[PDB]
């Protein structure tokens, strides 16, 4: 089967460091292919030495910040029945998307029966969050409502839920995002906590 | 009050100015140029070479200590304010000129607040003499398309400079208080 | 026998690169022919290796055996900096008293002009304003290859030229916004483009009426017709022209409505206000007569009070600025009762200088909650004036 | 007359809109009282103002309101007797911001949880500049007083909020105003009152029930008239759809009905029965009651004595003594006695431990009321006891 037009959408996980992305074909092929990727970035050359865990990742490394130059990449496929290529351009500000935070736990308070404490941790792959302020998005919702409540938070790794119920548990899913550059990331894995009840 | 509330007020004012600049840039791109709003239209910059750039490395950005960054930001603010006044004298539209004058006076107030903060931190460099060659920058004889491209590049550079200044203020807050 | 005309020679050729108009002149050798034989002169234009775009024939006759120099002009559809152009001339003599064969003259040697590159401008023309829907072609001179050309999201077809030049054919251009439409030529690593403006000629100014507050200056207000779609440095310019005194006032470009200023000259009393509209596309004029004595509009008198001696009741006295020492007034006065009756009457006054006036009343009434209101006019039949503030300063009763 | 400089140094700032700074007029001067207002940013001075001739109390301050800047304003007094200024005040326009009340308030039912009621709204364009604290007030459409939510619960900016521990089947209205987080600033106006109902919350209360001992004549089967009162709106928590009863008979035998109307006609026999009812809400069945009818040959079974009735304050009152062993339920009936006029039997339910309870109806005065009290035991009721008592 001849190769088709692949999909090329890159994403920057670390803003101070470089970025990485892959390329795949919509229709699979029964024979192996050979790929060659090159970067121009105006009038320059990029090597992006390849040493990933999963293939098709050369880990392009950034060199300048706030260069106001639209990054463009061009891929090329090869096959015994044909050879196509794809060139996609973007910017160094739209592909910025951090990783979902880990170690998201909650704990009730013994004094108030309708208050919960949520404390999470910053992603390890992301750099120092104190230098680059992040924006967290907490969503607390019971296990039977199936209606998420969107609450935007400021810089901080703590939240005091004053809307929690006294006889039902909740689930918390928090995301990660820079202050003014990039879009929202994925949510957390899971969370479970019960409120305090006197007996 | 000291550097406590002043830096927070400056950061909030820079965020407000960033939002206002985003709105004004959307309006300006929707208004000026049919091939400017919906298409990409990324041409090589060969017309604008006098305005200061905002291309710095991470190490040279972390090496400075609250002085060279402030001086360079003041110079860039003065130059971009002069260029914005020139663009205001160039444009002719009632509501557009009103919003542009509002943005200009807000940027002037922000520059005055930054100068007051610099004079309040106890640094023996109140106000060095800036420029005086581009202090007016009269409009030369050029083409209309060249002027539009220069204005677009100036808006892009001003947005990038505002973002870099916000990030530098965040870095200063991280390096100074804790 | 067969008579053939002498081979003509091109005297001098030139052109203007600003308006893209060709200039051609030649002197026919008519001194060797005493008869007034009709000579048929035809001109042909050829570019990019003899395309033979358009032919043109000009019929004339020699002047009694004398060489007369004449000039001929022609406007090309494309700028001169787009390609090279050659010019050739030939004639055909026609004699009445000859029965032989008359064969056309031989073509003159080739004559061409080449635009030497002096500026970095590569797209022609530069800020040209024409009538809407007119056909205009652009040219982009360069040394490398280009990709395509378009105005906006159109991708119009391209036409190649002899040496590394591309031209486009645009027909029936649409209207333009406040900013001129932009055309570009997409190159491999660069991009070149210019701006073109397409607007409408200035419409005839309607509703030309002129009123005056005082007899010292004249103001006129009207409204334009269709929009010219040319705002900024190329906006319209209105100018007033006087008949006898010859005075003129220029409009200051700054809206919906506007008013001009014209200082009055004494003892004229007759003016034919003509409005001239200047525009690089069209011109319009409007002649409307006016009477400085029949189009008078007084102002509202201010700073007036009510006071009198224990004699007959109040005598109003208002202050109306201006110069009305020659024409009298017909200021009608109206007095209202305690929200029941409002009497109407009229009094006359003479001409007074920049001071208050003198108006007398007779047979008034006690307090009875009376009020006052003034409204002045002119002896001529025209519009009235605006009202003033109401006053109720009444004298004692009983 | 002296200039009489203004004072009280108090005025507000609007969210980008035109702002007027207020000052006190003072006393009767009437000497060309036309004040002027100045502005200063310590680097650039704004254009001065001019007091209005009609009300020289407030005028324009700044055309383009800028936040986080030190604005110095002072009202100067100008008259014929010299000139004088007033006291200076330094304030931040971001502190005196008067925001807009949140619009588009709506409450919804998520998953039929009768305990929590969520509410959402849209924050104004000032949410990205200042932190807003909320104070929600709710009340019943019938009541005229409002109930305030603790302010310490909504002290921070939030997009949604849920009010818990509400009453079932009662309509609530909501309005909210916001201001700065710290408290230094002027309040905002009240938003539009948004309607909204609560959840269903099926009633956990057994409705009333009472039967009749009418003397049937068809040599056996007795026609008993089952009559029960209508459940109150607050005690029903929703529209009453239909009633369901349950009849008990000999072993391995039972019947029931689901008639929409509140009236049933079921036959009887010469054996003991037991009738229970159960009202069905939108979610399911409610609680049931108990009642037995051993009307074959039952005895009075210690009827209640010492029956006295005297209204003695604006309404009739009934009192009696405690029987020998115990009482399970209490029930009393009454009607109007006159010259050839049929009276309907109206009654109500009372607990066993209570021996005095005033009736609830729409009775009038100057009429003869025959209050009949009948006890309720585990093996049938007792003999009725009637007594007459007027009202006024
Ligand atoms: C590369 O991919 C394109 C599209 O994915 C292929 O284009 C197809 O060509 C065939 C034959 O001309 C057409 O019938 C299809 O409609 C085309 N697909 C489209 C237009 O989506 C192309 O053949 C591939 N290979 C090369 C060498 O270009
Ligand atoms: C076009 O014009 C040029 C003038 O630049 C002509 O070139 C001349 O040619 C004659 C003889 O052919 C020479 O004697 C002149 O010296 C030339 N002039 C120059 C070089 O400036 C040319 O012949 C004309 N015709 C064409 C077809 O090019
Ligand atoms: C240019 O094209 C427009 C349409 O794109 C022409 O406008 C039409 O004109 C005809 C009569 O000439 C009308 O019947 C149509 O209703 C018009 N259509 C529109 C959309 O306005 C216009 O006439 C053309 N101009 C020239 C010079 O050919
Ligand atoms: C009215 O005023 C005009 C002002 O120019 C006088 O001049 C005439 O202007 C018109 C313009 O349309 C010309 O056609 C005439 O030829 C002008 N006349 C002269 C004598 O120059 C005009 O004369 C005045 N009218 C009268 C009746 O005097
Ligand atoms: C929030 O609720 C208000 C009133 O409850 C509604 O406002 C309507 O907005 C639309 C579009 O702006 C208008 O056409 C209507 O006239 C408005 N009123 C009504 C009664 O529909 C709307 O549901 C919400 N408002 C906004 C701005 O989203
Ligand atoms: C990449 O490598 C292939 C063969 O490995 C070669 O044909 C191609 O020219 C190279 N460059 C690009 C941009 O594909
Ligand atoms: C203008 O009006 C005056 C008086 O109303 C009159 O005498 C004079 O003839 C008028 N002028 C013309 C040109 O009719
Ligand atoms: C004037 O002062 C009073 C306090 O006595 C108080 O109403 C407020 O601070 C001021 N009111 C106005 C309208 O300025
Ligand atoms: C207002 O009062 C001042 C006080 O001296 C006076 O000078 C001025 O003429 C008055 N009127 C106006 C319009 O300012
Ligand atoms: C019949 O039952 C329905 C609910 O099932 C309710 O409208 C009412 O109890 C009855 N209908 C009428 C018209 O009374
Ligand atoms: C009434 O009896 C029917 C069967 O005859 C049964 O399905 C239904 O659940 C009963 N209703 C109640 C309220 O017990």
Author numbering:
A (entry chain C): 107 to 305
B (entry chain D): 34 to 211
C (entry chain B): 132 to 385, 390 to 533
D (entry chain A): 124 to 515
Give verbatim excerpts from the published study on this entry.
CLCF1 was also found to interact with CNTFRα and signal via the gp130-LIFR heterodimer analogous to CNTF, and cytokine receptor–like factor 1 (CRLF1) was shown to chaperone the secretion of CLCF1 (6). The bottom centers of LIFR and gp130 juxtamembrane domains are positioned ~22 Å apart, comparable to that seen in the CNTF complex. CNTFRαF172 also serves as the anchor point of the CNTFRα-CLCF1 interface by engaging T193, W196, R197, and K200 of CLCF1. Multiple electrostatic interactions are observed between positively charged CLCF1 residues (R48, R95, and K200) and negatively charged CNTFRα residues (D234, D284, and E286). Key gp130 residues engaging CNTF maintain their roles in the CLCF1 complex, with F191 engaging K42, D45, L46, and Y49 of CLCF1 helix A; D215 forming a hydrogen bond with CLCF1K42 at the center of the interface; and W164 capturing the middle portion of CLCF1 helix C. Similarly, site 2b (1325 Å2) has a larger buried surface area than site 2a (944 Å2) in the CLCF1 complex and greatly increases interactions at the composite site 2, which may explain why CNTFRα is indispensable for CLCF1 signaling. Like F152 and K155 of CNTF, the two conserved CLCF1 residues F178 and K181 also serve as key anchor points engaging LIFR residues (S310, N313, V315, I322, G324, and V326), consistent with previous mutagenesis studies. We found that the CLCF1 complex and IL-27 complex appear to be more unstable than the other signaling complexes we characterized since the particles imaged in the cryo-EM experiments for both samples showed a very low percentage of full complex (~2%).
Glycoprotein 130 (gp130) is a signaling receptor shared by interleukin-6 (IL-6) family cytokines (or gp130 family cytokines), including IL-6, ciliary neurotrophic factor (CNTF), cardiotrophin-like cytokine factor 1 (CLCF1), leukemia inhibitory factor (LIF), oncostatin M (OSM), cardiotrophin-1 (CT-1), IL-11, IL-27, IL-35, and IL-39 (1). The extracellular domains (ECDs) of gp130 include an N-terminal immunoglobulin (Ig)–like domain (D1), a cytokine-binding homology region (CHR, D2D3), and three membrane-proximal fibronectin type III domains (FNIII, D4 to D6).
